[PDB]
Design a protein around this ligand. Structure first.
Ligand SMILES: COc1ccc(C2=NN(C3CCCCCC3)C(=O)C2(C)C)cc1OCCCCOc1ccc(-c2nnn[nH]2)cc1
Ligand SMILES: [Mg+2]
Ligand SMILES: [Zn+2]
Length: 333
């Protein structure tokens, strides 16, 4: 429940981000982290600039100070893990900004829905420990038992939602405190629906529902809006392969190390270790990126672009050039 101090706020406000354009599709968060000995302050400043530059917080009665308090309460609940840390959720926030404003998806949503999506990026992985839903269920960890007894197998996504509600229950960090009645309800419900939809076990069914709503000129409007928000948070979450090859590769190194640490702990517990979680298989980075592109990311981006989101064509183009580059790594090995 512990309030953000003036000194914590000042450490973010001093960062000027010289030579960076946080609105650009080629923005490099790894270069921003290396540019300073306070990468946590720079990351918080990127999020702050993105939210104020949208012009949205101003319109919904969220002060500069409440916005920065929210950003810093989110930052305190991320852990020192290789991939699911504060840098991932700031990356997802920046990426969604590009999808809304460079890919023109803002045209499909209200200003409130655009504001909720940028805020939801920063809560969507709160208190991730670098272990996936499967780890908690296979090991019968206490959180796994609660999820099973409770009837919801989205172990981590329900936990993230719980900590988001906690942050927003204090007016000093409630970016939605300017709303009342149906607008306040829509902000909380849409945020929660979006976080729950990031569970990759629901990937196929969430994509098929969005594609069927987009094809139907008589789809319920409220339902189309909600599904568009869910698909944009999902797109940000699997956007690593849509970036400049070097940025893409650094993300792939970070996620591989997190997977390998999970596999190490599964060996110690004596439970099943999948091949891509096992250090001993020594599986090549190139073959793993090509597989992720072919079976997950290329069909996802191509289908949503063709169905509805024409302005995001650059994502399909960049996945194509990244696949070709991984093929040159194999051809020359
Ligand atoms: C920068 O890179 C990556 C970024 C994110 C991921 C993820 N991955 N996951 C998945 C975990 C388990 C796999 C299932 C999906 C979800 C996440 O939750 C997340 C964390 C989204 C992964 C990144 O690197 C990828 C490494 C090899 C993956 O390789 C493959 C191959 C083949 C098929 C495949 N074949 N047939 N059907 N699927 C899938 C994946
Ligand atoms: Mg997640
Ligand atoms: Zn995520």
């Amino acid at each position: 429940v512990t309030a953000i101090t003036k000194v914590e706020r000042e450490a973010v406000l001093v960062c000027e981000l010289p030579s960076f354009d946080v609105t650009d599709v080629e923005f490099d968060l790894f270069r921003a982290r290396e540019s300073t000995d306070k990468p946590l302050d720079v990351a918080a400043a990127i999020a702050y600039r993105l939210l104020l530059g949208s012009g949205l917080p101003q319109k919904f009665g969220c002060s500069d100070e409440v916005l920065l308090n929210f950003i810093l309460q989110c930052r305190k609940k991320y852990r020192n893990v290789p991939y699911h840390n504060f840098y991932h959720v700031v990356d997802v926030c920046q990426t969604i900004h590009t999808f809304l404003y460079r890919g023109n998806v803002y045209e499909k949503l209200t200003e409130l829905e655009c504001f909720v999506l940028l805020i939801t990026a920063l809560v969507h992985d709160l208190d991730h420990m670098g272990l996936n839903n499967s780890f908690y269920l296979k090991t019968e960890s206490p959180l796994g038992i609660l999820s099973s007894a409770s009837g919801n197998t989205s172990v981590l996504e329900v936990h993230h939602c719980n900590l988001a509600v906690e942050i927003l229950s204090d007016p000093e960090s409630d970016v939605f405190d300017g709303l009342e009645g149906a607008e306040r309800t829509l902000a909380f419900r849409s945020m929660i629906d979006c976080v729950l939809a990031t569970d990759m076990a629901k990937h196929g069914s969430a994509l098929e529902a969005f594609l069927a709503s987009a094809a139907d000129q008589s789809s319920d409007e409220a339902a189309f809006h909600r599904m568009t928000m869910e698909i944009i948070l999902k797109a940000g979450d699997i956007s690593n392969v849509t970036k400049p090859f070097d940025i893409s590769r650094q993300w792939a190194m970070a996620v591989t190390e997190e997977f390998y640490r999970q596999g190490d702990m599964e060996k110690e517990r004596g439970v099943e270790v999948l091949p891509m979680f096992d250090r001993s298989k020594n599986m090549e980075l190139a073959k793993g990126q090509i597989g992720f592109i072919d079976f997950v990311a290329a069909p996802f981006f191509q289908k949503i672009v063709d169905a509805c989101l024409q302005g995001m064509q650059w994502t399909v183009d960049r996945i194509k050039s990244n696949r070709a580059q991984w093929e040159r790594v194999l051809e020359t090995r």
